Design a binder for this molecule. Structure first.
Ligand SMILES: Cc1cc2nc3c(=O)[nH]c(=O)nc-3n(C[C@H](O)[C@H](O)[C@H](O)COP(=O)(O)OP(=O)(O)OC[C@@H]3O[C@H](n4cnc5c(N)ncnc54)[C@H](O)[C@@H]3O)c2cc1C
Ligand SMILES: [Cl-]
Length: 227
């Protein structure tokens, strides 16, 4: 969260949050080069631009991936500000940072998952507790051909033809929100699709399987095959 250094980067101070998250004690920090927490993650130009900005008097802003002691990595979002003389010359440096511990890990994850899901070439969507699409894979969007953003708000029934059997569609929907396994053929419509046009219908074999998460949480995992 907060530290101050002399012009050369030697930590003069060293706040409680900084000690907390760095898992370093204030006495192991004070008098150390701020390089102590460096991680190897950043290239020298990132560091060189930082020092090139602050030493000419300007505020700097950026993220830092830092090293905790036990060698583990954290993230911080920083603003570094110079303190001046007299002769308008930087004399000390104040760094105010929030720990983005955390939101960063919770993000490199999604990217991995998202990356794996996206490569699935089965047509798949995910539904929340209310049976609204929380995710639609590229195979499905491609074949639909609706862009995922058309889709996210909705209802899988947005994929169905106006010709579809309403009583089946409803069975599916009720399975989704209950959440129970369901499957079995619905007439879908795809955009062809400038259009409007539009529009071919085709029988879809459809499976849903509920997935309970923690916190009374529910997702419906949905497969769409051409029957
Ligand atoms: C207030 C304050 C807070 C900082 N917080 C962090 C932090 O949270 N995490 C972190 O990794 N680093 C931080 N630094 C800076 C620092 O230098 C650490 O060493 C950094 O980790 C450097 O890594 P490097 O070994 O890759 O440097 P090197 O890159 O090997 O430095 C060599 C090149 O010339 C440059 N240059 C011009 N003046 C200087 C100077 N005075 N010191 C170093 N290079 C200079 C560029 O640094 C450039 O990289 C902070 C500095 C200040 C002043
Ligand atoms: Cl058939």
């Amino acid at each position: 969260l907060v530290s101050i250094t002399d012009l050369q980067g030697r930590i003069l101070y060293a706040n409680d949050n900084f000690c907390a998250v760095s898992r370093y004690g204030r006495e192991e920090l004070v008098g150390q080069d701020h390089r102590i927490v460096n991680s190897g993650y950043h290239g020298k130009a990132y560091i060189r631009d930082m020092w090139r900005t602050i030493s000419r008097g300007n505020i700097w802003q950026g993220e830092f991936c830092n090293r905790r002691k036990d060698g583990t990595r954290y993230w911080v979002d920083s603003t570094i500000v110079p303190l001046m003389d007299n002769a308008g010359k930087p004399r000390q440096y104040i760094s105010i940072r929030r720990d983005i511990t955390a939101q960063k890990e919770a993000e490199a994850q999604l990217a991995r998952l998202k990356q794996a899901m996206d490569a699935n070439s089965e047509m798949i969507l995910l539904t929340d507790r209310a049976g609204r699409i929380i995710y639609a894979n590229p195979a499905l969007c491609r074949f639909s051909g609706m862009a995922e953003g058309e889709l996210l708000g909705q209802s899988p029934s947005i994929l169905d033809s106006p010709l579809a059997d309403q009583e089946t569609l409803a069975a599916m929907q009720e399975a989704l929100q209950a959440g129970q396994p369901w499957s079995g053929r619905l007439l879908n419509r795809r955009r062809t699709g400038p259009a409007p046009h539009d529009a071919e219908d085709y029988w879809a074999e459809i499976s849903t399987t509920p997935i309970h998460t923690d916190g009374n949480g529910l997702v419906g995992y949905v497969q769409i095959q051409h029957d």
